[PDB]
Protein: Tyrosine-protein phosphatase non-receptor type 2
Amino acid sequence: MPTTIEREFEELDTQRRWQPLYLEIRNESHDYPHRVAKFPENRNRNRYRDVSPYDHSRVKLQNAENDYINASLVDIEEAQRSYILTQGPLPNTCCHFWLMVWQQKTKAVVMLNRIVEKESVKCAQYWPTDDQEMLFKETGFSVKLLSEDVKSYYTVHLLQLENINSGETRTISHFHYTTWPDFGVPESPASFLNFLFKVRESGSLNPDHGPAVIHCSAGIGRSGTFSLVDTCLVLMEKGDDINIKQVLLNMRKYRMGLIQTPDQLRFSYMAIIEGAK
Ligand SMILES: CC(C)CCN[C@@H]1CCc2cc(O)c(N3CC(=O)NS3(=O)=O)c(F)c2C1
Structure:
């Protein structure tokens, strides 16, 4: 029979209620303090003045003079899942990004943007593209490209993250979705689901590892879409119904503006429907 989410989707589609439902979410999302992001010392650590992590859920850099990073811990207790959603690193925050990855014991970095989108740099080149070692002297980290697996719409880079201070190294999986435009959607629910199931298959979203770092340019539109679909598919496993609107409103309490367009909200519904099959 048509599932409850399938009927909710059919109702929104035939009644053309996507733009009003998105506006409902926007007006029902409560604002939370983000005073630390706005400190004058952190102005050069933010990529967008209107995108800030909340004080109650920001990720702190441990043992640092300035513990600030534009990253949020998004916890979904019910789904047994936590992520770090962050902006695409700036040239001066690449060292903080790698320090965060180490401290949080992250195993995978999920990248949903391209470095250059619509005539603008949306992210720094924070990982090496060749055999040259990329050095982050501020925090004491090295990154070396170990291998690259190129697919039509995504690439997986294996990276060696060296902590020079401790002499330890770790293998990080860098899942780069290369065909998801800024403020746009992936070309199909199947391509997004195949990429999502590749990240899951690696164990990087499990509780035996630290939270996976999900980023696009601002860390809210495409990262929000990816995270909602993944969380809703886990909540779906208990045979219950999910109020997608409420799960998104709950996620928006950890990081502001998750899902930036009504078409990204519609895509989240199609992907959750096809995923649960
Ligand atoms: C929190 C909210 C009120 C701020 C709303 N203004 C900011 C303006 C700058 C900006 C730039 C982006 O590239 C994007 N992305 C769109 C997408 O699909 N993924 S993304 O996060 O990289 C933004 F969402 C925003 C939103």
In short: Residues 48, 50-51, 113, 122, 182-183, 216-222, 256-257, 260 surround M5R (CB under 6 Å). The radius of gyration is 18 Å. Strands lie at 71-76, 81-86, 108-111, 116-117, 120-121, 134-136, 141-150, 154-163, 168-177, 212-215.
